[PDB]
């Protein structure tokens, strides 16, 4: 019973500072890598950072480098996300997930491997990798959704994972390290890659599949990419 319980919602004015906590359970806290993301009111989702839970090591883009502070408490697991000076534009939903294994033989920090969500913390202050932005199809057909990168991220690493979101849900897992599938997952979904550019297979379309799918992927000196999203429509 994996479960990540986050911090409640909370609404700050321009200028101020803000703690998200997110306290995991059903697991070694100090054995998996822990992920900050969040999503903007009708945008797409944004990676804020990774961290390290046994060592501390935390690294963050280029853009939060130094509004965001993430740090962990071992002796009670759990994680705590600070941001500084807010604006309108930090008006987001923000999660934390579980991300690769702390291993001793390899990095699975960047590994866009986000099995396990929170619930989300809503906060009110008051492009990337190219996906095309709707795809249609109708019951029973097949369709498939691009997703265009360049070299040094999607043209050379295995490492890309889909997701799918319904209106007002959690993201969820569907494809990791461009073509496996997690448990639970419908055989429907397969994945490929050619070149610079991803792809998601769904084969037998139904309506369980309308959504909005977006694609993850390594993206150089330790950091991850999210796309711009595609939204399925069936006919």
């Known amino acids: 019973q994996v479960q990540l319980v986050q911090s409640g919602a909370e609404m700050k004015k321009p200028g101020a500072s803000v703690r998200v906590s997110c306290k995991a359970s059903?697991?070694?806290?100090?054995?998996?890598?822990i992920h900050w993301v969040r999503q903007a009111p009708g945008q797409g989702p944004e990676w804020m950072g990774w961290?390290?839970?046994?060592?501390?090591?935390?690294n963050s883009p280029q853009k939060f480098q130094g509004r965001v502070t993430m740090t962990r408490d071992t002796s009670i697991s759990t994680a705590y996300m600070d941001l500084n000076r807010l604006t309108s534009d930090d008006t987001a939903m923000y999660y934390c997930?579980?991300?690769?294994?702390?291993?001793?033989?390899?990095?699975?920090?960047?590994?866009?491997?986000?099995?396990?969500w929170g619930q989300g913390t809503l906060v009110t202050v008051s492009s990337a990798l190219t996906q095309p932005a709707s795809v249609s199809g109708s019951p029973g057909q097949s369709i498939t959704i691009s997703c265009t990168g360049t070299?040094?991220?999607?043209?050379?690493?295995?490492?890309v994972s889909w997701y799918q979101q319904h209106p007002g849900k959690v993201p969820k897992y569907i494809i990791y390290?461009?073509?496996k599938r997690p448990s639970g997952v419908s055989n429907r979904f397969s994945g490929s890659k050619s070149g610079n550019t991803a792809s998601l297979t769904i084969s037998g379309l139904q309506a369980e599949d309308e959504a909005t799918y977006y694609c993850?992927?390594?993206?150089?000196?330790?950091?991850?990419?999210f796309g711009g999203g595609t939204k399925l429509t069936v006919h």
């Open positions: 997930t579980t991300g690769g294994w702390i291993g001793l033989y390899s990095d699975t920090s960047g590994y866009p491997n986000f099995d396990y």
């Open positions: 059903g697991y070694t806290f100090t054995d998996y890598y």
């Open positions: 961290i390290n839970p046994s060592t501390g090591r935390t």
């Open positions: 070299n040094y991220d999607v043209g050379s690493y295995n490492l």
């Open positions: 390290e461009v073509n």
């Open positions: 993850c992927s390594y993206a150089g000196s330790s950091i991850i990419f």
